[PDB]
């Protein structure tokens, strides 16, 4: 989750999320550099009494300020597109979990073996336990095995929703009649939070996502106990 006065991304929980952090640092450096070049050149243009107001020839400086930017875009696209195709590679999940968006809560289905499914609703604020997070907690968390490749499938049974977990770098829209796939792999145990990310009506603000990542053996016993 996010903490007070956070400036940047939530710490990465998956290798792809870490990849995105470094790509963002790379791109942000270019962003700061170009904008500060522009602010600087502006202040430069504006701080002299010297004048030169006759027609000026553009027939050469346009080469520079067209090729330079072309080169910069390429320096961005290269790593951008390496990551894109990375997140598309074949991987072979150990486990498939479905989530279905609803107004206003998520349901989850783990049906590889048994028929396990349950609803996951926000903890109302008047019912939070001491130390729990307003708007973020759910009654039934998404328990998953850590250090394993998981295929998440996302759909909806009513309007659009979108299923997001920022620290894993995940956001997959939930569309009725469609089954969208993404993969999930946590490097660490713990609790990882997200929020519905497509406007869906009265309680769009209040249908969060909590993943609970634990060792496989605990996940198996948890599964069995939820039947």
């Amino acid at each position: 989750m996010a903490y007070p006065m956070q400036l940047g991304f939530q710490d990465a929980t998956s290798p792809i999320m870490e990849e995105l952090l470094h790509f963002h640092d790379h791109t942000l450096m270019i962003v700061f550099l170009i904008s500060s070049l522009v602010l600087y050149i502006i202040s430069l243009m504006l701080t002299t009494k010297l004048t030169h107001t006759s027609t000026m020839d553009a027939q050469e400086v346009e080469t520079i300020w067209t090729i330079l930017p072309a080169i910069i875009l390429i320096l961005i696209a290269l790593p951008s597109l390496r990551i894109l195709y990375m997140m598309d590679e074949i991987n072979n999940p150990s486990l498939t979990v479905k989530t279905m968006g609803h107004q206003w809560y998520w349901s989850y289905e783990y049906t590889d073996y048994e028929d396990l499914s349950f609803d996951s609703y926000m903890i109302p604020t008047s019912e939070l336990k001491p130390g729990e997070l307003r708007l973020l907690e759910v009654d039934n968390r998404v328990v998953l095995p850590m250090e394993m490749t998981i295929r998440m499938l996302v759909s909806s049974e009513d309007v659009l929703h979108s299923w997001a977990v920022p620290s894993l770098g995940l956001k997959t829209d939930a569309i009725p009649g469609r089954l969208n796939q993404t993969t999930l792999m946590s490097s660490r145990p713990g609790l990882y939070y997200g929020q519905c990310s497509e406007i869906c009506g009265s309680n769009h603000s209040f249908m969060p996502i909590v993943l609970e990542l634990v060792p496989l053996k605990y996940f198996e016993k948890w599964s069995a106990s939820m039947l």
Binding site: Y3, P4, M5, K129, P130, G131
Partner: protein, 49 residues
Amino acid sequence: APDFHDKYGNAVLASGATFCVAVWVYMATQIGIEWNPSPVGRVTPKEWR
């Protein structure tokens, strides 16, 4: 002939700045706004379970 700025420039600037600082410092600290700064270095963690 001194214009409006020669006449009032100094007072406008001084009083503008003094007033702005006063009222913003007051709004920020005295009427119960929740800034929610970071607990890092400021909060003593406390048993919750």
